[PDB]
Design an enzyme around this catalytic site. Structure first.
Site, PDB file in Angstrom:
ATOM      1  N   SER C  74      72.692  22.938  66.067  1.00 15.38           N
ATOM      2  CA  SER C  74      73.508  22.006  65.301  1.00 15.38           C
ATOM      3  C   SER C  74      73.057  21.959  63.848  1.00 15.38           C
ATOM      4  CB  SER C  74      73.466  20.614  65.922  1.00 15.38           C
ATOM      5  OG  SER C  74      74.369  20.518  67.005  1.00 15.38           O
ATOM      6  N   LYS C 184      91.486  27.366  54.471  1.00 14.82           N
ATOM      7  CA  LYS C 184      90.250  26.600  54.518  1.00 14.82           C
ATOM      8  C   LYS C 184      90.203  25.501  53.471  1.00 14.82           C
ATOM      9  CE  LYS C 184      86.090  25.147  54.910  1.00 14.82           C
ATOM     10  NZ  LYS C 184      85.570  24.457  56.123  1.00 14.82           N
ATOM     11  N   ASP C 188      91.734  22.126  55.443  1.00 15.12           N
ATOM     12  CA  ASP C 188      90.629  21.475  56.128  1.00 15.12           C
ATOM     13  C   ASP C 188      90.018  20.380  55.258  1.00 15.12           C
ATOM     14  OD1 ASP C 188      88.022  20.810  56.996  1.00 15.12           O
ATOM     15  OD2 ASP C 188      87.351  22.879  57.051  1.00 15.12           O
TER      16      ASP C 188
HETATM   17  N1  LIG Z   1      82.833  16.020  56.057  1.00 18.67           N
HETATM   18  C1  LIG Z   1      83.706  16.997  55.892  1.00 18.67           C
HETATM   19  O1  LIG Z   1      84.585  17.251  56.722  1.00 18.67           O
HETATM   20  C2  LIG Z   1      83.608  17.823  54.645  1.00 18.67           C
HETATM   21  C3  LIG Z   1      84.428  18.922  54.454  1.00 18.67           C
HETATM   22  C4  LIG Z   1      84.248  19.734  53.352  1.00 18.67           C
HETATM   23  C5  LIG Z   1      83.267  19.432  52.445  1.00 18.67           C
HETATM   24  N2  LIG Z   1      82.500  18.340  52.627  1.00 18.67           N
HETATM   25  C6  LIG Z   1      81.572  17.938  51.581  1.00 18.67           C
HETATM   26  O2  LIG Z   1      82.310  17.465  50.495  1.00 18.67           O
HETATM   27  C7  LIG Z   1      81.506  17.592  49.306  1.00 18.67           C
HETATM   28  C8  LIG Z   1      82.335  18.138  48.174  1.00 18.67           C
HETATM   29  O3  LIG Z   1      83.725  17.912  48.442  1.00 18.67           O
HETATM   30  P1  LIG Z   1      84.827  18.961  47.986  1.00 18.67           P
HETATM   31  O4  LIG Z   1      84.878  20.076  48.951  1.00 18.67           O
HETATM   32  O5  LIG Z   1      86.055  18.183  47.732  1.00 18.67           O
HETATM   33  O6  LIG Z   1      84.304  19.470  46.576  1.00 18.67           O
HETATM   34  P2  LIG Z   1      84.816  19.074  45.130  1.00 18.67           P
HETATM   35  O7  LIG Z   1      84.012  19.800  44.137  1.00 18.67           O
HETATM   36  O8  LIG Z   1      86.214  19.495  44.995  1.00 18.67           O
HETATM   37  O9  LIG Z   1      84.622  17.482  44.875  1.00 18.67           O
HETATM   38  C9  LIG Z   1      83.491  16.850  44.243  1.00 18.67           C
HETATM   39  C10 LIG Z   1      84.056  15.864  43.261  1.00 18.67           C
HETATM   40  O10 LIG Z   1      83.067  14.877  42.900  1.00 18.67           O
HETATM   41  C11 LIG Z   1      83.279  14.558  41.545  1.00 18.67           C
HETATM   42  N3  LIG Z   1      82.100  13.894  40.996  1.00 18.67           N
HETATM   43  C12 LIG Z   1      80.900  14.470  40.679  1.00 18.67           C
HETATM   44  N4  LIG Z   1      80.042  13.648  40.129  1.00 18.67           N
HETATM   45  C13 LIG Z   1      80.725  12.442  40.083  1.00 18.67           C
HETATM   46  C14 LIG Z   1      80.362  11.166  39.622  1.00 18.67           C
HETATM   47  N5  LIG Z   1      79.165  10.866  39.133  1.00 18.67           N
HETATM   48  N6  LIG Z   1      81.275  10.181  39.722  1.00 18.67           N
HETATM   49  C15 LIG Z   1      82.464  10.462  40.254  1.00 18.67           C
HETATM   50  N7  LIG Z   1      82.918  11.622  40.727  1.00 18.67           N
HETATM   51  C16 LIG Z   1      81.993  12.579  40.614  1.00 18.67           C
HETATM   52  C17 LIG Z   1      83.597  15.894  40.903  1.00 18.67           C
HETATM   53  O11 LIG Z   1      84.235  15.716  39.648  1.00 18.67           O
HETATM   54  C18 LIG Z   1      84.540  16.491  41.949  1.00 18.67           C
HETATM   55  O12 LIG Z   1      85.893  16.151  41.679  1.00 18.67           O
HETATM   56  C19 LIG Z   1      80.306  18.458  49.694  1.00 18.67           C
HETATM   57  O13 LIG Z   1      79.152  17.645  49.830  1.00 18.67           O
HETATM   58  C20 LIG Z   1      80.735  19.072  51.027  1.00 18.67           C
HETATM   59  O14 LIG Z   1      79.636  19.352  51.887  1.00 18.67           O
HETATM   60  C21 LIG Z   1      82.641  17.546  53.700  1.00 18.67           C
HETATM   61  N1  LIG Z   2      84.915  19.267  64.200  1.00 15.69           N
HETATM   62  C1  LIG Z   2      84.293  20.059  63.338  1.00 15.69           C
HETATM   63  N2  LIG Z   2      83.524  21.047  63.828  1.00 15.69           N
HETATM   64  C2  LIG Z   2      82.881  21.839  62.972  1.00 15.69           C
HETATM   65  N3  LIG Z   2      82.881  21.808  61.639  1.00 15.69           N
HETATM   66  C3  LIG Z   2      83.653  20.825  61.186  1.00 15.69           C
HETATM   67  C4  LIG Z   2      84.379  19.927  61.943  1.00 15.69           C
HETATM   68  N4  LIG Z   2      85.066  19.041  61.128  1.00 15.69           N
HETATM   69  C5  LIG Z   2      84.738  19.416  59.917  1.00 15.69           C
HETATM   70  N5  LIG Z   2      83.888  20.486  59.877  1.00 15.69           N
HETATM   71  C6  LIG Z   2      83.319  21.121  58.698  1.00 15.69           C
HETATM   72  O1  LIG Z   2      82.050  20.561  58.460  1.00 15.69           O
HETATM   73  C7  LIG Z   2      81.721  20.732  57.067  1.00 15.69           C
HETATM   74  C8  LIG Z   2      81.130  19.453  56.539  1.00 15.69           C
HETATM   75  O2  LIG Z   2      80.549  19.648  55.258  1.00 15.69           O
HETATM   76  C9  LIG Z   2      83.008  21.195  56.379  1.00 15.69           C
HETATM   77  O3  LIG Z   2      82.946  22.582  56.065  1.00 15.69           O
HETATM   78  C10 LIG Z   2      84.088  20.885  57.416  1.00 15.69           C
HETATM   79  O4  LIG Z   2      85.166  21.803  57.337  1.00 15.69           O
END
Ligand SMILES: NC(=O)c1ccc[n+]([C@@H]2O[C@H](COP(=O)([O-])OP(=O)(O)OC[C@H]3O[C@@H](n4cnc5c(N)ncnc54)[C@H](O)[C@@H]3O)[C@@H](O)[C@H]2O)c1
Ligand SMILES: Nc1ncnc2c1ncn2[C@@H]1O[C@H](CO)[C@@H](O)[C@H]1O
Ligand SMILES: NC(=O)c1ccc[n+]([C@@H]2O[C@H](COP(=O)([O-])OP(=O)(O)OC[C@H]3O[C@@H](n4cnc5c(N)ncnc54)[C@H](O)[C@@H]3O)[C@@H](O)[C@H]2O)c1
Ligand SMILES: NC(=O)c1ccc[n+]([C@@H]2O[C@H](COP(=O)([O-])OP(=O)(O)OC[C@H]3O[C@@H](n4cnc5c(N)ncnc54)[C@H](O)[C@@H]3O)[C@@H](O)[C@H]2O)c1
Ligand SMILES: NC(=O)c1ccc[n+]([C@@H]2O[C@H](COP(=O)([O-])OP(=O)(O)OC[C@H]3O[C@@H](n4cnc5c(N)ncnc54)[C@H](O)[C@@H]3O)[C@@H](O)[C@H]2O)c1
Ligand SMILES: [K+]
Lengths: 458, 458, 459, 458
Positions: C74, C184, C188
């Site tokens: 994981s 992607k 996503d």
């Molecule tokens: N949980 C999930 O499903 C998932 C999926 C994809 C990515 N992520 C995470 O999302 C994060 C980035 O997201 P993204 O893919 O949209 O990238 P992104 O670069 O498009 O978004 C980041 C944003 O944060 C803004 N930012 C930076 N500093 C800032 C501040 N001080 N105040 C306000 N805004 C600020 C930037 O201007 C930018 O628009 C990463 O940490 C990545 O791991 C999570």
């Molecule tokens: N159910 C899931 N299983 C695996 N990866 C995922 C799932 N949901 C979101 N993610 C991925 O986990 C990452 C979180 O930063 C992203 O790349 C997002 O696309």
């Protein structure tokens, strides 16, 4: 004495109650404002509302007004152990343990109303479903004359009062708050809009955007279901029988369709529109009726479609047809697969099957935790305000000359309902505008209220 | 024979009505269902409603089932010349005129009844402004003795009947239809939701996503007003005085605030919440009241702002405060500029100026087209069916022993409203389901309806 | 063969979850058929570190079906789904993951992914998320990178770190930036959080949301899905951003933009924080991926009983270190905690001034819920399995030294394979694509069955 | 100097140029953000893009930064003298009207490049579609050695520019503006979500809540159109040839359909799906391709349906099979009525006839004013700064070696595209966060920008 499955669970109960009561501005405001005024002093109340921790806030509220109470549970399943031991620890007697066999509860139905082995002088009654409304008339009519009035909240039990009024059996007056604006808007329409897609996602975990759903019935609950599906991203069809309700569905952006050819149901395989049922993914039923989703509908349904009910009870979906010739297989506590291939000998990798939620009964209480706290608050706040108005009238102390004319079934006055709503506005942080004296005369309305007529449709 | 300005325009008018007929299913369906029966044969009706192509369609479908009618105008100002010619050249007299002048209705009214200088035999009245009721009662007493009934559309005019019924001055039964479901839901709610943003985006030609908006009052008009504005992309604030409406507005996703500190309207500038007004720019007033927006919100509003009124008269916004110190300038047919500097020193590059859309009067009828034809269609079919229900009784032919029991103001029964709604639902292509007998006794409602009780809110 | 998961008892439950799951992924299950007799991944070796949900099971099953060899673990502390991990372990894959882990446990589990009988096994491929697995192999155990064909990266926070190593010249093997595909980036990152954020908020604390106020930090690809998830429910949302372009887009969708600091300048004192707006906010969410976007002076100025949560990738967004040293903590249920302000080491049971925290400020939609749905995760996983084949053919470690230095870079897949995945993904919903007449293709300038947009197109 | 027409102008639009310029945040905000010093003192520019009320502001902006550009009108429409006579009144010659020489306005061009017979000295060019760009190579090449660069604003013209760069005939570097991200999303998407439904309603006055639609294409224009129709309550369907755009349409709450059975078009009458087509009440064309309306769907379409076009190319609707074989009528000065009776001879009472809103052309031009200010204001601000950036390089003044390597055609850099997004955000009243140096190090970006890589797809 107390009858609770375990008493040590009170330590968790108080911790759970303290955060929950922070979410209920109406009951807290009622506690705050009537401090010292004590309109409930000298009033002894008997209650029967279902024992959930939600009602513990109300029970602690009205006693803070100066009222002594005795308590029980109306339904044999609607109880919580940690809250029950909490009230038992507080001091008020409880019989809300879960026997789940209905033989132990029938032995204690009168145990709650008797002081020890005989009846006794009680002043007000608060019930749920009218089960206790039957009791004091039929079991122990002697204590009837001292009752000032009765508060009950159910629309299937209000009919009992309504048709015993004509028979002349009703001895003391009653009040109904179900037909009020705040309760009707909060309980029916909202909550469902908040919980339907919670229940669908908490159980199935499927995606909803880009799919097709059918909803039968467009009442208050039908509207709440239609909204909860669109905002997630689905495309929705509505089947209706009342022409006026169907006119609203079209003007809100829905396709009204009938699953029978020309709208006539002949009870034959050829009366169905097979070009519609063979394209839809999800079905939600929202009527208080019978057999709106019959046997012929489901045989034309597309494979892998989800069936769920939020209506009255297990009559809208022909679930009895299921156990006769189709097999059932379990995924999780309340999700099942029904296999259309045969009664037995089914296979895991099969293609023709159905997905059922909460085995037919209500789902948003079955596949989730139900209504939130901000919603089950104004429903409760109106009922405690029923006691205040009904206690001040002093029905029993009236002499026989004027006593006859105040035996009636009336509605909760509108002025009271404007005070529960005011606290929700302040609970959200809102501000309500005051009327200048010259301004309020133009409308022809008192400054304090009421503002709207009795026939107004909110 | 006619007082239309030009008889020749009837061909163009008819050209317009031919297309307009396409978008009114309710009127058309009546002709198909009731052909051969000819229910209106022998009836003689007077009318007074304002003229257009839409009411011309209504008159044509009225005379299609066999009635003979004479017609006039209710509003002094609103005139539709070509449609009036289109009917005056159809063989039905029309006495409308141009001049927008009140002094000639002394003759305009009398020409409606006088056939050849004599009272004309009448059976029904289709009055709108209530002025034919007044002349009918106070003039020509010997002639009203055979009139079967009256249908009125306005709540401000049905009051003049409901107050006089208790006094015994009313001599003929009447029907109020303004409280019918189709009339109430179509007009108050959906029309404004359709036309508010259209009027704004014609008058201003600006953009609406991502701006600050305030809506005062949360009635049905204001309930349909904010919906039209939230779709375009505005962040919208709501003000209200009735707590239950505000409790709805919070639960629709709006923030509820008031322009006064804590809501108390002192009158001095010390009480105006200077911070809130300083960043709003669009105002839509919904309430039917007086000085809901006094001088100190317009003296404290943001530098550039446009004012929109959708109320009923010139009392929502203090427009008479404008005429004495803030000057006006015309930029398009109806859009004005108001400079918050004085009546002297007009400058062309000023920054502190406000914008009115319809000089304070209601803007939908002034800056736009009004309601679409499809909505207005269903307002007229109920008035069609009311005439049938009154004609089926033969009130004037009943014995004088029973005539004393029929002077009443009743509402339109629910069945007729359901029949009107059905013809709409067939217009969109929707299909309404039919109940089997075994499902009808379950609710307690027959297969033909009506399905809802009198107390139901839709 | 050997595994250390929370339990084995739940093997049956995961399977039924999967059979349903397999019928919701047309694009991935398509390649399982098209390349059935043709087995491109025979003799391959992979080691992967991704969130162990119910979707990540199907990808392992696919790679095994095409002939790969898998050892998996994981990616996060609270991310695994203990019924989904049980089935993959029960089928024979050695895997090490459970719930409620610690930083002590986080590093042990990866340490078994490389080591076997204590011996680092010959790994040809790496499937990494978040740059954690990359760092050990480069800083430790250098012997592995001289027999690695390629690595695959999926999240945008690890892509930054990976392009960081190229400039320094410390990177040894090329990688495919799987994250920049359309199936992607715009399938996503945007729609996934829309489906899961307000699900996770409601399962954890369970408040009504219609009519409250919230603040959102960052308007990137995740920020848009987050804001839509909130707005569709009834919230009154505000967005904060550092980028002018994303701020303009946020203004265009019907949102209002504010900053926690006066005039926007973050001095560092308490006199720069605006308590006018923080004193009426019931919810804050971090979507930034940066450090210190919610600092200690913000938490003190916050309104009482407010909610905090994080959806980035690390714990640096909110200044947690202040909270865990100055304020006492109480637990009300898993992944939800209560922190009593002004109380250094004690708290009354009727206190009024406190805050609530969801899953201790880590990934909340994946820790407080079950993550994205199955249908959205079909495109990205298809891109991953596809990228495994493309690198597995070039045989990086077998190339000569002259030909070695011509293959060292970072790249993204060609558009046609993306479109092929998108077609099969559309066909599931029930759409019909229309083919072009031979005259129409010539008019527009593309082939009849070829690409329809140039590579510069943004969609 | 006046050459368009008579002066004719004193208050015929100059007044609302004020509200026009106040509406535009960035184009006026830069005027004072880069005032004080004037980087553009000596940039002699010529050519056209448009000539409107929103186009005269750019010239004044350039002049306020010190430029002395010379202007003329072009494109399909040149009657907009409500601002042209103002530009001439400002001291720079301009040409809009002419002796109905729409085939050849090159006579106007000869009146622009020339000053006293000798050509006017210039160093920069500002062109719309390239009909004037070719002149500095085909007719007058001797002037070009003084040019620093040129700006072009057309998708077809950049193709010719890249072709010229492929050839050798290119003799000056050129910058492109259509790639600006603040221009791609504004003019394409945001401009048609505000104008499509407004134009439909303006030209038909129809009701859309409940009707069904078909929109061909799901490009950026398609994305705007679908929202603009859905938000009004229609049921919208989507058709596309790109699988990726279809995937995007599936997850936004739309359905994907195909006018041809199995999507295979071959011209036969047997391959088309008339059942789907016989229920669509509206078709809008959004592509830029050929024959998305074959003659067969115009035959199978439901009676009285609406056809609309918003694209650029006119071969989308088979108008040649309509202006032949079928009869035409005009309802109003912009809407037409076409009969399917046959060759000729029609009675105005039929059931089969269609409607065209602009007769195959773009509806946002004829039936509406067009893109509002706050959208197309983002487009122009990319022009003045583009002049600013090319003026400090001094392309001609570099030696031979530098001049050979500087001949390159490039888009506008990302750094300049955020200095225009800032000034539009600041207009609505928002505030942008500034990063700390420790935060700037962690990401990899200087505190002044740019913040995102070039391959990022917003
Ligand atoms: N949980 C999930 O499903 C998932 C999926 C994809 C990515 N992520 C995470 O999302 C994060 C980035 O997201 P993204 O893919 O949209 O990238 P992104 O670069 O498009 O978004 C980041 C944003 O944060 C803004 N930012 C930076 N500093 C800032 C501040 N001080 N105040 C306000 N805004 C600020 C930037 O201007 C930018 O628009 C990463 O940490 C990545 O791991 C999570
Ligand atoms: N159910 C899931 N299983 C695996 N990866 C995922 C799932 N949901 C979101 N993610 C991925 O986990 C990452 C979180 O930063 C992203 O790349 C997002 O696309
Ligand atoms: N589960 C919950 O949370 C919850 C909450 C409130 C009410 N309810 C239940 O909901 C039920 C009804 O909802 P309501 O209170 O809004 O009632 P309602 O009367 O307002 O709505 C019922 C609607 O169904 C229509 N209908 C009747 N027969 C039909 C048929 N054969 N086909 C299609 N439509 C048909 C009726 O015309 C009507 O419009 C009641 O039984 C009530 O107990 C459940
Ligand atoms: N333009 C149209 O198409 C159209 C259609 C129907 C009615 N109307 C007019 O609209 C007017 C009002 O609409 P309605 O009939 O739905 O009203 P309504 O009767 O439904 O209620 C008016 C609302 O205003 C609120 N209100 C009253 N005084 C207030 C004050 N001082 N400040 C704030 N709120 C206040 C009330 O609480 C209520 O919510 C009527 O006068 C009617 O003539 C116009
Ligand atoms: N009217 C305006 O205001 C305005 C503004 C900008 C652009 N345009 C014009 O609009 C057109 C398209 O605009 P855009 O750049 O947003 O579009 P786009 O280039 O982004 O996409 C056009 C779409 O047409 C689709 N298409 C092509 N042939 C098709 C077919 N036979 N069936 C279905 N779909 C088909 C393609 O798949 C593509 O997705 C161009 O001609 C452009 O010049 C008009
Ligand atoms: K999941």
């Amino acid at each position: 004495d107390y009858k609770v499955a375990d008493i040590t669970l009170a330590a968790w109960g108080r911790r759970e109650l303290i955060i929950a009561e922070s979410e209920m501005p109406a009951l807290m405001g009622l506690r705050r404002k009537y401090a010292g005024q004590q309109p409930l002093k000298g009033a002894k109340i008997l209650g029967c509302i279902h024992m959930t921790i939600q009602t513990g806030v109300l029970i602690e509220t009205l006693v803070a007004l100066g009222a002594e109470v005795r308590w029980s549970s109306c339904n044999i399943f609607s109880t919580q152990d940690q809250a029950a031991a909490a009230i038992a620890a507080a001091g008020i007697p409880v019989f809300a343990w879960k026997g789940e066999t209905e033989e132990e509860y029938e032995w204690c139905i009168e145990q709650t109303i008797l002081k020890d082995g005989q009846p006794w002088d009680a002043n007000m009654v608060l019930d749920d479903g009218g089960d206790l409304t039957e009791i004091l008339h039929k079991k122990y009519p002697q204590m009837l004359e001292r009752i000032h009035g009765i508060t009950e909240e159910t629309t299937t039990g209000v009919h009992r009062l309504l048709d015993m009024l004509k028979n002349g059996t009703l001895k003391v007056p009653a009040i109904n708050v179900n037909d009020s604006v705040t309760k009707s808007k909060n309980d029916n329409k909202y909550g469902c809009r908040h919980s339907l897609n919670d229940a669908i996602k908490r159980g199935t975990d499927h995606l909803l955007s880009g799919k097709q759903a059918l909803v039968i019935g467009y009442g208050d609950v039908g509207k709440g279901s239609s909204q909860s599906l669109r905002q997630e991203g689905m495309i929705v069809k509505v089947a209706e029988v009342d022409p006026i309700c169907a006119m609203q569905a079209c003007m809100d952006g829905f396709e009204v369709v009938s699953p029978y050819k020309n709208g006539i149901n002949d009870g034959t395989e050829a009366s169905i529109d097979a070009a519609l049922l063979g394209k839809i993914d999800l079905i939600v039923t929202t009527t208080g009726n019978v057999n709106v989703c019959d046997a012929n509908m489901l045989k034309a349904l597309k494979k892998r479609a989800v069936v769920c009910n939020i209506g009255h009870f297990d009559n809208e979906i022909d679930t009895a047809f299921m156990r006769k010739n189709w097999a059932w297989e379990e995924v999780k506590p309340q999700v099942h697969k029904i296999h259309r291939t045969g009664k037995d000998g089914f296979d895991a990798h099969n293609d023709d099957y159905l997905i059922l939620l909460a085995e037919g009964r209500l789902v948003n209480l079955g596949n989730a935790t139900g209504h939130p706290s901000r919603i089950m608050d104004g429903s409760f706040a109106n009922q405690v305000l029923a006691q205040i108005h009904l206690f001040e009238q002093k029905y029993a102390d009236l002499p026989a000359a004027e006593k006859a004319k105040r035996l009636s079934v009336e509605v909760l006055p509108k002025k009271l309902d404007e005070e529960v709503a005011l606290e929700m506005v302040k609970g959200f942080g809102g501000v309500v505008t005051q009327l200048t004296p010259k301004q309020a005369e133009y409308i022809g309305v008192s400054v304090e209220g009421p503002f709207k007529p009795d026939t107004y449709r909110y």
